[PDB]
Amino acid sequence: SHHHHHHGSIDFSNAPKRLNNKYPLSDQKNEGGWVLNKKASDEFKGKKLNEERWFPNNPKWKGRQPTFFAKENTTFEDGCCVMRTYKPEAGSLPEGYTHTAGFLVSKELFLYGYFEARLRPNDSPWVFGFWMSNNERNWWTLIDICENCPGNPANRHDLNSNVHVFKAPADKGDIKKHINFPAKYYIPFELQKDFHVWGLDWSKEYIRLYIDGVLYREIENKYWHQPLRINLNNESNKWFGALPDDNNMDSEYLIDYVRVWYKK
Ligand SMILES: [Ca+2]
Ligand SMILES: [Cl-]
Secondary structure, eight states, rough: TTOEEEEEOOOOOTTOOOOOOSSOOGGGGGGTOEEEOOTTOOOOSSSSTTTEEEESSOTTTOSSSTEEEEEEGEETTTTTEEOBBOOOOSSSSTOOOOHHHHHHHEESSSSSSEEEEEOOOOSSSEEEEEEEEEEEEEOOOOEEEEEEETTTGGTTTTEEEEEEEEETTTTTBOOOOOOEEEEEEEESGGGGGGEEEEEEEOOEEHHHHHHHHHEOOOOSSSSSOOOOOEEEEEEEEEGGOOOOOTSSSOOEEEEEEEEEOOOO
């Protein structure tokens, strides 16, 4: 029912005001005792990718057909990482692929902390994503902080969330079949119009998901105790109606920053 079901609406009347760029938007006074991770955080200034911090594509996933991840689709302009979608000449991509999109993967691994990103969605039928994942030694889990396609006009007022356990050994959940727990919420604004701030407070006890500083989901952390990498990308997905449109593929997915904090 997650295609139709808005569990609730998200109220922004009491959303926190921006006071500083040093702590999470949901905790601007730092009641949680955060320290900024200066290795992993990226304000995306300048003109070139920091390839010491990020892989320029996804070395382990070519992409969901028909969209193929490519390095050239990611540039850096006006203090933002900019991801675009292209359609190369016919026959240029491997079989089944027709368009290209950007993808960045963190070289650092993380387990627990605060993770925040300021994103301006692309107004095109490509899912835009800020998420975390690891598939390692028969343990494969994923936290889908942001996986949305407001570029499909039918999804403009949706805010999705999901967490996945693709596989887990006997002592870490004993999961042999993929399981996930999606939930959608209603937001009063069209998502693709402006920048918005996605936040994740990830602890051994809970996964807490925030939008523009407002808590909108709490999950009991029963399975997500595996170190994960940060992923930023565009991709195709028929479930969101996110299939290429040659007459609407000129938009830009903008990432202003990615910030990471640790405790103590
Ligand atoms: Ca920036
Ligand atoms: Cl902001």
